Amino acid sequence: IKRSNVFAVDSQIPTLYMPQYISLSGVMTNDDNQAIASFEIRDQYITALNHLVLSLELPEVKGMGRFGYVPYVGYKCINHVSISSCNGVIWEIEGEELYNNCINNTIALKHSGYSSELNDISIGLTPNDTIKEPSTVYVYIKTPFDVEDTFSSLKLSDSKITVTVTFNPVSDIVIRDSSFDFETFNKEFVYVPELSFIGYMVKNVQIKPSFIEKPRRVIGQINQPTATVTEVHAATSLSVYTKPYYGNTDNKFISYPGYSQDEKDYIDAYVSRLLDDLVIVSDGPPTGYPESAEIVEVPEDGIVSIQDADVYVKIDNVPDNMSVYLHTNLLMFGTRKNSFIYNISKKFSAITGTYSDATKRTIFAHISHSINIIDTSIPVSLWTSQRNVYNGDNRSAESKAKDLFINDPFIKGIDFKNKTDIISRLEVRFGNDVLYSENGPISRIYNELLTKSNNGTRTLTFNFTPKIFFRPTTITANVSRGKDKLSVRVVYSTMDVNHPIYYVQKQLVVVCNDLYKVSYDQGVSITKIM
Amino acid sequence: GAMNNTIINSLIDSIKRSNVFAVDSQIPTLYMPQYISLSGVMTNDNQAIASFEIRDQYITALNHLVLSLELPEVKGMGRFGYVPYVGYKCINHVSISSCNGVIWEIEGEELYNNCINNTIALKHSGYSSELNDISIGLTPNDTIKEPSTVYVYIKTPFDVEDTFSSLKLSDSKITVTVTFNPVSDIVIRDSSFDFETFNKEFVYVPELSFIGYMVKNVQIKPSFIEKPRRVIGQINQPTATVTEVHAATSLSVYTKPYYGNTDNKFISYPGYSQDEKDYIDAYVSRLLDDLVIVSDGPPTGYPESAEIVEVPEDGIVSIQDADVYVKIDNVPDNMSVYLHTNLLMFGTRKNSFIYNISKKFSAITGTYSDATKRTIFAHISHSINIIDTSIPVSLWTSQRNVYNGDNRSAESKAKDLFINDPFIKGIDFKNKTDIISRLEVRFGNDVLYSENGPISRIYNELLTKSNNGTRTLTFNFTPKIFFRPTTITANVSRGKDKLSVRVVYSTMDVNHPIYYVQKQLVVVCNDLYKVSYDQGVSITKIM
Amino acid sequence: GAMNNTIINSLISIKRSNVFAVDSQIPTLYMPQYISLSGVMTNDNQAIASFEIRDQYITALNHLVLSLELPEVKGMGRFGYVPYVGYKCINHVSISSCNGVIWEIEGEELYNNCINNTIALKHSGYSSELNDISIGLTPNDTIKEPSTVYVYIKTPFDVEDTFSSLKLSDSKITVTVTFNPVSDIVIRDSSFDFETFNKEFVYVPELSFIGYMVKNVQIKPSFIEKPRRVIGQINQPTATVTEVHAATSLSVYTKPYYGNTDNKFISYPGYSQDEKDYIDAYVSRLLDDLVIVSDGPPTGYPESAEIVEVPEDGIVSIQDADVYVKIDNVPDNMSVYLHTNLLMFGTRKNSFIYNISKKFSAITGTYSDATKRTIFAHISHSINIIDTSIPVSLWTSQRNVYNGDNRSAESKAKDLFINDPFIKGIDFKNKTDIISRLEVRFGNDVLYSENGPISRIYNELLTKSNNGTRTLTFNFTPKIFFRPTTITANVSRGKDKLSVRVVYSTMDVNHPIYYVQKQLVVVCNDLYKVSYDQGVSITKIM
């Protein structure tokens, strides 16, 4: 019997080439006066390239107040990336989409800026105090040219390749308090980029045409559950997700965990911030709180009843001249005077600790509560919104002054962790006919399983064929029949009107990957498959 | 320029070269995928059986089977929580069959074992603090657990090479049958919880999803499939045999505990936190309540068998050869510090060796709270292991014990939890203790393989990139789907048609309760079958 | 719910490749077996294990795993094993035949190749049982229980399983394993009897491999990458690799040299190996001498120690640095004291001082009447990974105008000996980047230069590793199925060597870390051709 050899193979002689890591400085242009970096790659010996890495020199941050960078700061800096030739754009991506494509890559995410040095909230006490030390971050600009290394690489057929990087405002990548002088920081801050790539000098290159997937995104109107992608002729995939819109707020939040980014870390940071005003050890009724505040003295039993909710408060080593007090309405929301009230104090069941005579403060030991990721994600503006018949924010001025501005451009869902799924039903139509529909997030489950990711989206994959070696499988259009567009309609999950999160404005994001043919006939050019 | 002169000169034509910078983009088979979800037909030894029928002219092929399950709202009084990876634990057996019979089938535990290295699949099946932490109900209408939906990835051989490996429907009807384990297996609860009503009210609500493919002019070729078979040996017996082995790709060997001789009750459980340290810390925390007592005079509410001793001025309490250092701050003048010297004890003879849990503690420090009237422990020095946390309560009070055994308070005993997890391995909750001292595999009369160390487990973990492997003998190192798998071939005439497994178990102390944990040997064999798509899908055992 | 009408209508002459079915090819008839062998131990009287593989059945092999039997450690003192103990045991591994060495690697290079394999690292010995520092109280007390560790000897024969496997053409294959002294793999204090342990300790190895009995094997020649390392002279920022004719890659990194010290360190975190774990362990060790609750001025400290009573406001000023100390439940007869110069360093009197006490800003806690000790709650400090990595010898060096170590005798007795052979950079985590510039010359011409560690970023990205090195990769061609792409020599032009020049950043002379010696490591992977014609043999590509 004829047998295939599994113990030996003919070591084929490959194309004669030589790689080199090339680093280039850019040309900065302020064009809405947005920072734009341009990198021109033109050399007769750079035959092909891939693995684009953009480095960024973050400056020394000096002065007073609270300051920190958003996690994966390097990716958050990116607004748009374009790779173009003389014939036009070869490939381009939106900042968030590049990040989404790199969310599984722990190494790329770490390189972009994910450390306690960068992401923890540091405090500066004097005008010449160093808040943050200068650092360099590296952003892996993942392109379709990296899929199969040399086989997939961008070939430069004697053409000039321009890599354009559009940057987001520094407001988006920074978490700060009112005390921090952001006005001066915004004026003084400048993006310092450098583009690196693996260049290949190839001897007698044999160029063949290839296929590329170019992502397109469409953002629907504020609170609009529909979005449409026009002129769809050959699509490999379609992703659907939601983003919050905070334009109706001052983008201020009570707490932030810093480098520690788990759901529990977000919750613990919030609890810690509230505990300062929640349980007070004072000689007589506490002061510095608004008139709307209902601070009740804890009885001998330790139980304070806020309607049907019982809060057990027991503090050790309390001085004889002092008493234990509980703020029964620290944060409250109500649309009507005779409606359900969402009270944050009611989310606490037990608070234990010991009063320190030396530092004159309470040292909390164990806290029993029901605080969730949504509570930590509520903007402060929504607690004091017009819709609320109550004051809302009954915290001290000291606590309110510690509030942080978060303008992270890549937030998904209605919480900081994208934990809460707000899509109750998804409907995708090709033309007018229903292409796909679901009541459960089964497309997200398949995305997470097939891509081995923990942070996936509701994705419809049409290409299950191996990349580069095969022409990708695409959903083909029929203009005559009307099937030349992908229309998405969602049904948002119904939330209680008396909860502050109900008023978070939502935006539907639809991402479509269209197939293009790469032609190298007299320069690099792409053609949309139609 | 950008390229260095040294590189340029080094490069700047006679030999034939393979192109590594470009490739001919081959046109693939014209197809269209679709995520299809189906509702089942529920049937009821009164075990739940869900049936899903897949029959469509246009569903040419399928793969990536995912079973969703709607978990109900749990209301009432008592302690309740779901086992980790609840979705997998629900599964007793999965079968994929056609008109010609079974195409592929797996046992619940084997599907779980095949998915243990997939963190995503495990998370989807139900692994969260919301599901797995032990929640408490205070009133008959208090919500213990909120309704949730779990997703179970039914990994099949059809997913290995995506479209290439997919199950081709030769215009035949495919039935997917799912047999469910009793709800007792997936739930951790105390005595206070009304399990009787819960068992009656609970219903499995499944839904089968799969990636279906509509293929234009499909060119079908025959393929090969590995079907797993398991053999469970007799209780406490160190042998098991898999008969009729003809063409096997692999053989796995592991141990399972048997708790049929117990009420399946355990002192503690850590919840969502599943590390070895989490299991130990939960156990220590549960005992500390009755171990160190701050009371005005001798403590009450403990059995007569208990020996609660007052801690002397030096802080050292001697329990035979073991010294326990107990020092509690802010103790009221009217009160004293007491140590329970025999919280849990075991012995087979009146004056023999004694396994005392109190003796496993060396130092206990803390501060008494006047406000809450309880001790707040700071630092604990102990030698509590994963085995202690895995001892069923029944064994502490068994007939073998000359002592009372359980000298805990009634309050502590009432907090004990029922754990019926069907996929436990070894003699502890983490499968930490290796109880197999030697393993021998015999293919007839001749020794096929033998080992003193779990080097077969090390190879399994390395080759499968898994952290929780088993002693596995792999015979197929050939790439799957593209090649016919390599197997251990049988010689019927020489009696080499059966795989016999013999183990040498470790010897444990009779005065330690873990000695009485019954063991079962599990042997898993993957048999090679040929998939014939000639007039309906059918399988044939390679013999 | 079934196939949707839109999909059916979309589908309902060109040659198409079948992606739904494939011809299940009959492979070469073979049979694998996990074979385990015992070695031959030989004896600076270095331990060497030899494993001879020669069998008519064994046609080919791969996936070498070396197991090691760690003994029961009994007696007094503090003892622990280094993390990944199994890899740290290895000094060198060589696979040779009658024709000579087929492949060989240095201990550290094998570890470097396995650093991205979490499973291989766990198997080698990474647990609280092995790596935490355990204490022995009686001469017959068990410190560490006996355990078995498994070391995955990653070779080029594992890359493509059976395809890449080492073929044994009726030749005798010898696997030689050289072991590092037991001093390298063990973390211990002065109380521990290392002298007896070193005498009593014996390496107990066992080599396992996946062997293949192949029927009518069809052997073809292959290519192998053999790593070579060159260690530069102490603190010299240059190193050269000679006879470089065809190299697939070149790596550059730094190692510390502690030959000028007794290899003693104040603290070690144990199994917990994060940067924060190293810092927290150090802070915890200093805290008992830093803040003292005593009736009158504290005793048991050298005369050089400046222990100041904490004032009513809690602020103690050490020059420009203010330290806030507030301890609860302090007895009326006792006072709170702060050690203002626990560890200090300076090369000139009345100049800049590096004081560890000055690195603390706030210390809070509660005094325990029951245990007669302070239980610290919150500590605000600026202690870094470098502080935890300073050998004790440097604090009391001749360069220091001060006593340096003003800790108690109790604290000094708890100091641990760390001789880990695979440390990189100038700290235990290799956090501090000490290379400011890298220059690589092929012959006399500049092959590559960088000011930033972009070669390390590329290494980490391409190898999916979190702990990479400045690496220049020349081969981007798939392995086994293709002949690797390499740099080409030109003997006539003198281009047959790789010269590395780095520019190190300079430390402050008044910081003890300036006195930690450095060594430049350059690793070169040369291409060799594997021939099976009358035995297994390798030939260097020119």
Ligand SMILES: CO[C@H]1/C=C/O[C@@]2(C)Oc3c(C)c(O)c4c(O)c(c(/C=N/N5CCN(C)CC5)c(O)c4c3C2=O)NC(=O)/C(C)=C\C=C\[C@H](C)[C@H](O)[C@@H](C)[C@@H](O)[C@@H](C)[C@H](OC(C)=O)[C@@H]1C
């Ligand atoms: C499980 O996959 C296997 C199924 C095989 O069976 C079988 C019947 O089905 C195949 C499929 C489905 C392929 O898609 C394929 C392929 O795309 C490919 C070559 C050609 N290979 N070479 C021919 C001669 N050789 C000495 C050099 C290159 C193939 O033969 C196959 C192939 C088969 O033969 N690729 C190319 O032509 C090009 C343009 C580049 C290749 C680059 C590197 C070299 C390869 O990717 C290496 C790294 C390996 O990954 C593969 C070889 C896979 O081997 C393993 C163990 O994974 C193999 C596909």
